[PDB]
Amino acid sequence: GSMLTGVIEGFYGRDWRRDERATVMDWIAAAGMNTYIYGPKDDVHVRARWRVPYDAAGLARLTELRDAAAARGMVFYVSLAPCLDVTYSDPQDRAALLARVDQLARAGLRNLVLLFDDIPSVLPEADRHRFDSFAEAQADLSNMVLRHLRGAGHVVFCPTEYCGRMAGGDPRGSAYLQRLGSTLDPAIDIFWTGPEIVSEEIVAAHLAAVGEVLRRRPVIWDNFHANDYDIRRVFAGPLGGRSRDILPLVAGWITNPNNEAEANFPAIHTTGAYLADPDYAPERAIAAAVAAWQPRFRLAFGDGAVPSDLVALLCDLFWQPFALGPETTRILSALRAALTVPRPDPSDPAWRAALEDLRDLKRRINKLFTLMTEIENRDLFHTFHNYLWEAQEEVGHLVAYCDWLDEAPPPGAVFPATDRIHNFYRRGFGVAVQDILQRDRQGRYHHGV
Amino acid sequence: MLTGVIEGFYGRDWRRDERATVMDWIAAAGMNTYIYGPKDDVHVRARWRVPYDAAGLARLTELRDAAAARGMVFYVSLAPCLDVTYSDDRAALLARVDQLARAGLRNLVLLFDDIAEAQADLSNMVLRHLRGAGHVVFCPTEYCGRMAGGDPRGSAYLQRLGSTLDPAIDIFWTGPEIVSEEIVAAHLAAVGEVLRRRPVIWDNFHANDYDIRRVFAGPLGGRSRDILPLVAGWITNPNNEAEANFPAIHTTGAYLADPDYAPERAIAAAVAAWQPRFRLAFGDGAVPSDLVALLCDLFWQPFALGPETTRILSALRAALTVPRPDPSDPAWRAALEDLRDLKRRINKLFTLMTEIENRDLFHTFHNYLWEAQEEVGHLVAYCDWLDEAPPPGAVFPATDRIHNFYRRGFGVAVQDILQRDRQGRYHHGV
Ligand SMILES: CC(=O)Nc1ncc(CN2CC[C@]3(CCN(c4cc(C)n5ccnc5n4)C3)C2)s1
Ligand SMILES: CC(=O)Nc1ncc(CN2CC[C@]3(CCN(c4cc(C)n5ccnc5n4)C3)C2)s1
Ligand SMILES: [Ca+2]
Numbered sequence: 001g002s003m004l005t006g007v008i009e010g011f012y013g014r015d016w017r018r019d020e021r022a023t024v025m026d027w028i029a030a031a032g033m034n035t036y037i038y039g040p041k042d043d044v045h046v047r048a049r050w051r052v053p054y055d056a057a058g059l060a061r062l063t064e065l066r067d068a069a070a071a072r073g074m075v076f077y078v079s080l081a082p083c084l085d086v087t088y089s090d091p092q093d094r095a096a097l098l099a100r101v102d103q104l105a106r107a108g109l110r111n112l113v114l115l116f117d118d119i120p121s122v123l124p125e126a127d128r129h130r131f132d133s134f135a136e137a138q139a140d141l142s143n144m145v146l147r148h149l150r151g152a153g154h155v156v157f158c159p160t161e162y163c164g165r166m167a168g169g170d171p172r173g174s175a176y177l178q179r180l181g182s183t184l185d186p187a188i189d190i191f192w193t194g195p196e197i198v199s200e201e202i203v204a205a206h207l208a209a210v211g212e213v214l215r216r217r218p219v220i221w222d223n224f225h226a227n228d229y230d231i232r233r234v235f236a237g238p239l240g241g242r243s244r245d246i247l248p249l250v251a252g253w254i255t256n257p258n259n260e261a262e263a264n265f266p267a268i269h270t271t272g273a274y275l276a277d278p279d280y281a282p283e284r285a286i287a288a289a290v291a292a293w294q295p296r297f298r299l300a301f302g303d304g305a306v307p308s309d310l311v312a313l314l315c316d317l318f319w320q321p322f323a324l325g326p327e328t329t330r331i332l333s334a335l336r337a338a339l340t341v342p343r344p345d346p347s348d349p350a351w352r353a354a355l356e357d358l359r360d361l362k363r364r365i366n367k368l369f370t371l372m373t374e375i376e377n378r379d380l381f382h383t384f385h386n387y388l389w390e391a392q393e394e395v396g397h398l399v400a401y402c403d404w405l406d407e408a409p410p411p412g413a414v415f416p417a418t419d420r421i422h423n424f425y426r427r428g429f430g431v432a433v434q435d436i437l438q439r440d441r442q443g444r445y446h447h448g449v
Numbered sequence: 450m451l452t453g454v455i456e457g458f459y460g461r462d463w464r465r466d467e468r469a470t471v472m473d474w475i476a477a478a479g480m481n482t483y484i485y486g487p488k489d490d491v492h493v494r495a496r497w498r499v500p501y502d503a504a505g506l507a508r509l510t511e512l513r514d515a516a517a518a519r520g521m522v523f524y525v526s527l528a529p530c531l532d533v534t535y536s537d538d539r540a541a542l543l544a545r546v547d548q549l550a551r552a553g554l555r556n557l558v559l560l561f562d563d564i565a566e567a568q569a570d571l572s573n574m575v576l577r578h579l580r581g582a583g584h585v586v587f588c589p590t591e592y593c594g595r596m597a598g599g600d601p602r603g604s605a606y607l608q609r610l611g612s613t614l615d616p617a618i619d620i621f622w623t624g625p626e627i628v629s630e631e632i633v634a635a636h637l638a639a640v641g642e643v644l645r646r647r648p649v650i651w652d653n654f655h656a657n658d659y660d661i662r663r664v665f666a667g668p669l670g671g672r673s674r675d676i677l678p679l680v681a682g683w684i685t686n687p688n689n690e691a692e693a694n695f696p697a698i699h700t701t702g703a704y705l706a707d708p709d710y711a712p713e714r715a716i717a718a719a720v721a722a723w724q725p726r727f728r729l730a731f732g733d734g735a736v737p738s739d740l741v742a743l744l745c746d747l748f749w750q751p752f753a754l755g756p757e758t759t760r761i762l763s764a765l766r767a768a769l770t771v772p773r774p775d776p777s778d779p780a781w782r783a784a785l786e787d788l789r790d791l792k793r794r795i796n797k798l799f800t801l802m803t804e805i806e807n808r809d810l811f812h813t814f815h816n817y818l819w820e821a822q823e824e825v826g827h828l829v830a831y832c833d834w835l836d837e838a839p840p841p842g843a844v845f846p847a848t849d850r851i852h853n854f855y856r857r858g859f860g861v862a863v864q865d866i867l868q869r870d871r872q873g874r875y876h877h878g879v
Contacts, residue, residue, distance in 0.1 A: 012815075012819070013812070013815065013816070014812055048803070048804070049731075165849075196852070196853050197852065197854075198852070198853060198854045200853060229819075229823075229852070229854050230854065230857075230858070231661060231662055231816050231817070231819075231820050232661055232662060232858055232860055232861075233857070233858050301496065317859055318859070321854055321857065322853070322857065324858075324859055324862055328859060328862075332862050332863070332866065335866060336866060339866065339877045342879060373495070374495075382460070382461050385459075385460065386460065386661050387661070389459070389661075390661050390859075390860055391859055391860070393659075394859065394860050394863040394864070394867075395863070397863075397867060398863055398866065398867050401867055401875060401877075414874055414875075415874070415875040415876070417873070417874070417875050421875070422626075422627070422628075422659070423626050423628065423630065423752075424627075424628045424659050424660065424751055425659075426864065426869065427660075427663075427751065427752065428660065428662060428663045428754075429747060429748070429754055429758065429820075429821055429824070430662055430820060430821075430824055432754055432758075432762055433762070433824040433825070433827075433828055434824075434856065435871075436762065436765060436766060436769065436828065437824075437827060437828050437831055439856065441865075443847065444844050444845065444847070445831060445845045445847050445851070446845070447769045447831075449772055
């Protein structure tokens, strides 16, 4: 029945504003979820200066957040990361962590996340005589925190190895997780991101193996909708790659979403749908999300709104970490097939259809882009402005190339790029690296043989 | 001569404090102008017919006063070109000009970049309404060589514009392209001929609104000082991120002032001036000058990587002419070691940036630095695998060494189809 479900503010970049946190909490509550975790990397007291307690203002914002979540039938957690230059056995360090916990506890914030995701290269020297491993040291420090709470509230532990790859493939083969699962107090839940930091799929056999080594069902920390790893990307598609059959194997489900608060309407809608609806299907879920989301696209000067089909296009373009949207996938795939020859036949309906859909894609992106400039909510506009520009430019250049092939140029003729494509397109440091570190169609890396 | 910056890019407009910081830098660099024209202001372009409310006009006069205090002039942009009937609309434009004029803002930019005799007449009307007070600068529809068709003297538009626009009105020009790699003396002499006046340069060399992936912290390059006799003004349209533009403004002011201007020497002087902004929070440190220099080298120019970064990658390319580099070859060993050192230095820079006092400067470069770090790390993982001397049939174990999320998405899918070879030619993989 009951289970921790919701969002972690846990990404690398600027933290959300008070109003953005309120909007997101609204969306969490509307989606049937019950948790907000405060842990933005931008907060100095979480990680960088973990020894230093909050001043009155910092603590007041936290209690306000707890109250705001409470009013929506939600729980609120506060993160700490005492892992940067911690001596796990040291009195002053243990006491300094206890003071942090005491402050939060005396202010009524007894729901804590302890993070241990970034440590030094070997065990500290003053700790080697007390503890036999990082796992045992972290476990003891966390158990101290749990015991200070006196059976009230809840502790969730982020491990150093929090995915399959970090644990070495099969999590049951990790020395770290073996010692962690046996040493961390049974009352403390453990985060897990699946086989990777950003998991393409989270499957039942994986989670069963994780539960074995951890000695408890994991709380999922899903990075499926996270975009902090790529400046070029945002994820407005549905949650995918997790069957509902995995949910019996977890103790919780927290999602670490896009940096841009306004980008997360579909992430929250569809993740809530996944957790609630036994018939969850990503393409049906995104349709329901798009219908709910569409009134946010009202136009500023007159009685219009961006059409549902163009909002749907927005999600298709900006879909998922390991898939383009169904429309965009098929358009590009059709073009690839038609481009197996150096000169496609302009009379061939395969080519003609592929080109026409590409042209139509261009016209629709243009329509969407123009209408986005006209919406009332400028935060939503600026969320997608640059991502939309990028897509528009790419599609335009592909259209100009395919249009030139549609004239049936001779085999020796070369595409007149100087007249058709801007000089500034596809340049810089990342392109220079990608020119050396090539990747072929089957996914294999090479440097041009 | 008009010298300074235009706020004229596509994206979010600057905050009051960011505009203040930028004006400080303009003044410190020996320049004298700030142009207000952000695409985010509805009254500039989208709803050009609608006058400012009291608050909107008050922010503008505040900006003019803030420029004045620094010995600077302030301009306000208008773009009556979207759905204008040039002969109709005239009164609505006159009202906009009257408001600004009655509030003491008589320095105007008229933009006609998205649609000659019609535009000229409309602009002359605005000039005549000002009654000989203040100044009008005109942004033409064809504002670069490419738009004019190569030689600007062959443009029917510019020919008619140059003869019809009032002589008191100056004209913007971006060089041979929107973002010019080079602006040369013969080009600007031809521009001056067709326009019938020396152009005011609007330089987009430091602009980054065209690419989500890019920011330009290197020196101004590709313009000789021998071009400056051929211009009436020099305005730069810089990076979206205000804190990114310290080197852009420093080096552009150096270019306009210093007869011995040389980009690599100028960036050293910029880095030395910029370094105290990188003071560390709680403690007496700052990010080392050499790591701030690395920041500019990584994030250099629109048409060049920095000199250090260029040489590191070039050395690696040469060493990778074979399918299996010899781990005993000093060419390979040197290239790999410098790559490793590049990685270590980026890491050092990145870590130290997380610790600086100025959080706006941190968040300016946070994402760009991550991106560079990730790319370098993956290249190192690949080159490290080659350094073990794998057999010719063996394939790089990417799944264990490179993150599953790396180099994916819609733009990568398009680029996979629309390929480009080493000589710059487009194709679709034969
Ligand atoms: C327990 C856990 O899963 N915790 C997470 N925390 C943040 C998360 C979301 N992303 C997903 C992939 C990854 C791995 C490293 N990474 C970084 C790291 C830095 C320093 N920057 C800076 C700018 N962009 C960055 N990206 C991207 C973290 S998941
Ligand atoms: C007269 C003049 O020089 N005027 C300019 N004004 C802005 C400028 C700076 N950039 C340089 C290259 C370029 C060409 C178009 N462009 C766009 C256009 C749009 C709509 N978006 C949206 C998001 N990103 C965009 N980028 C990038 C404009 S130059
Ligand atoms: Ca990247």
